[PDB]
Design a protein around this ligand. Structure first.
Ligand SMILES: NS(=O)(=O)c1ccc(C(=O)Cn2cnc3ccccc32)cc1
Ligand SMILES: NS(=O)(=O)c1ccc(C(=O)Cn2cnc3ccccc32)cc1
Ligand SMILES: [Zn+2]
Ligand SMILES: [Zn+2]
Lengths: 261, 261
């Protein structure tokens, strides 16, 4: 199975997952040469993000990240079709090199990155089916840097120790997922790309918000150190660290921005 | 038929060249978190680099770069064996994005990069034989930034229109190779890595000089527009552009520096 280190690492994903060596691959470096303002890029509206605190949502360690399952009444409004949420998850580095975003800005990594995965539910019945299809997926990406303690991110991080090993799960009480979004969500980068993990399907409409959020050093350390890739009884455990893909070449293409200034 | 673009591009090299998916890969991003000063990195000595102008050296387009063969009486001293020169070559971007170095520094590409490849002549008959043996190869890397015209690099670039196509060869009068190196060669980064092209053998001691050299926009444009990956009679020509690999995960390596600040 695929990993981010050793012989089954990212340069080897295209053996089993051929789209990982195809076109339109993400993530990419967002730098000024390739940015172009597009006034078509109006604000998205986040509907159904205030999750019932009387519902619970499943947190899982799937051996590659920590993921929270989201309900399909949560969706983005503002794109041509409605895209309904399926799950959120994160990517990060390690305590010796705590710069594990997937997208970079002017060559720089942020500390970590959150992805909120959605699929086109006007065209397709579930995310699985949409994933290899035209217009199938939309991912929101939030860049994370170190700064202030973030109570909202702690609504997820306080459950990490319950999902330390692969296959483990936890229930998280509903909270307002919009609290994980940064300031001025009107300001974003937009490009068509791919899933950043196998099968790397080139079917994602990316929205990367312009502004990062902050989490404290202790929150970033917990994310980096709480999880393993491996099942609890694996005699050779592997820490879940450095779970981000290297940036891909992105030639003769633009990233569109909703901001000029 | 590996390339830098499309189905046979770098995310697919591991399908035919297993070491490209193995550990210890180059190039890498040189950034503070993984740098450590090592006072035992004393200056290299360049001997036999001043090639006679009355002698001539073979320049060849190998389908992937342009290479100049170097004589075995050219060596680097300072390492724990003598390493003898075998060839130099370059990596670059394209006319609309002159940012094609292999190594990056704090996330930023340079315009291009020169590699001067050596093998341990104390231990091996030639560079082919040295290439699977632990530290059988030492490559020096010079970062190239867009700047002033460089008459020494022009001793190579003035021959480019004679090696436009794969397999073509030209003779370059000898000059002093040390003129291709930057200021303050005593300041360098050193690390254990690999060849940056197939077969990606993890058998290179890398020395990247701290300081770049400059060549002009016009010399970059000539390098970026003169050469083809394909033979003169190929009916699907491919321009030799963007012939650099993306940077690689560190795999727990540090990069040692001969300079402390
Ligand atoms: N990091 S990212 O936001 O780009 C991303 C989001 C979702 C996934 C998957 O769902 C992967 N996945 C897991 N099971 C799948 C079945 C079909 C297709 C994809 C499948 C992979 C990466
Ligand atoms: N860009 S770099 O300086 O890292 C580099 C330098 C040398 C080579 C080769 O010689 C490739 N090559 C070509 N034929 C070979 C036979 C054995 C081993 C390697 C062989 C590839 C990359
Ligand atoms: Zn993701
Ligand atoms: Zn090279």
């Amino acid at each position: 199975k695929w990993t981010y280190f050793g012989p089954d690492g990212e340069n080897s994903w295209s053996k089993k997952y051929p789209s990982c060596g195809g076109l339109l691959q993400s993530p990419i470096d967002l730098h000024s040469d390739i940015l172009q303002y597009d006034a078509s890029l109006t604000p998205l509206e986040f509907q159904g993000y205030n999750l019932s605190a009387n519902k619970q949502f499943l947190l899982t360690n799937n051996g590659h990240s920590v993921k929270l399952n989201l309900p399909s009444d949560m969706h983005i409004q503002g794109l041509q079709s409605r895209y309904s949420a399926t799950q959120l998850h994160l990517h990060w580095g390690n305590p010796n090199d705590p710069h594990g975003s997937e997208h970079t800005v002017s060559g720089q990594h942020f500390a970590a990155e959150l992805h909120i995965v959605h699929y086109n539910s006007d065209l397709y019945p579930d995310a699985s089916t949409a994933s290899n299809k035209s217009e199938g997926l939309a991912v929101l990406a939030v860049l994370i840097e170190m700064g202030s303690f973030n109570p909202s991110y702690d609504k997820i991080f306080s459950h990490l120790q319950h999902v330390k090993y692969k296959g483990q799960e936890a229930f998280v009480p509903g909270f307002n997922i919009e609290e994980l979004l940064p300031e001025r969500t009107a300001e974003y980068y937009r490009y068509r790309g791919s899933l950043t993990t196998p099968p790397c399907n080139p079917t994602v409409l990316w929205t990367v918000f312009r502004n990062p959020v902050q989490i404290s050093q202790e929150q970033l350390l917990a994310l980096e150190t709480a999880l393993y890739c491996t099942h609890m009884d694996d005699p050779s455990p592997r820490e879940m660290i450095n779970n981000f893909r290297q940036v891909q070449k992105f030639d003769e293409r633009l990233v569109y921005t909703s901001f000029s200034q």
